[PDB]
Amino acid sequence: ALGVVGVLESYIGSINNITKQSACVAMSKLLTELNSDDIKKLRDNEELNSPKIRVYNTVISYIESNRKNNKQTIHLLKRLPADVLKKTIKNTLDIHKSITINNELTVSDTN
């Protein structure tokens, strides 16, 4: 029984017998845990027209959908084509690596 991140990574890679249902439940937990205010800091630090801006805004929208309608957002994730779900999860795992911390905080200067 892996944790949230391990379950999601397993689903992306089609290993450890993780089902789409378990992945979407775990994804909902990850979206709850992620701090959307910190993602907005990352987004605002991008140069304008950076393709990352759209990614950050997608994860931000999914956090808001998950916060309003938890179980419907899980169903929405289950309805997504597998390849679209996996891209959304991968982007969300990437943001998790960038913002998880015990904090107020700033954004790094390197590029």
Author numbering: 73 to 175, 178 to 185
From the paper:
The HRSV M2–1 RBD crystallized with two molecules in the asymmetric unit. A notable exception is the C-terminal region (residues 178–185), which could be clearly modelled in one monomer in the P3221 crystal form. In the tetrameric HRSV M2–1 crystal structure this region was disordered and thus not visible.
The M2–1 transcription antiterminator factor is a basic protein of 194 amino acids that exists as a stable tetramer in solution and is essential for the complete sequential transcription of mRNAs in HRSV. It harbours four distinct regions: an N-terminal zinc-binding domain (ZBD; residues 7–25), an α-helical tetramer­ization domain (TD; residues 32–49), an RNA-binding core domain (RBD; residues 69–172) and a C-terminal unstructured region (residues 173–194). A crystal structure of the tetrameric M2–1 assembly and an NMR structure of the monomeric M2–1 RBD have been determined. Given the relevance and uniqueness of this viral transcription antiterminator, we set out to investigate its RNA-binding domain (residues 73–194) using X-ray crystallography and folding thermodynamics.
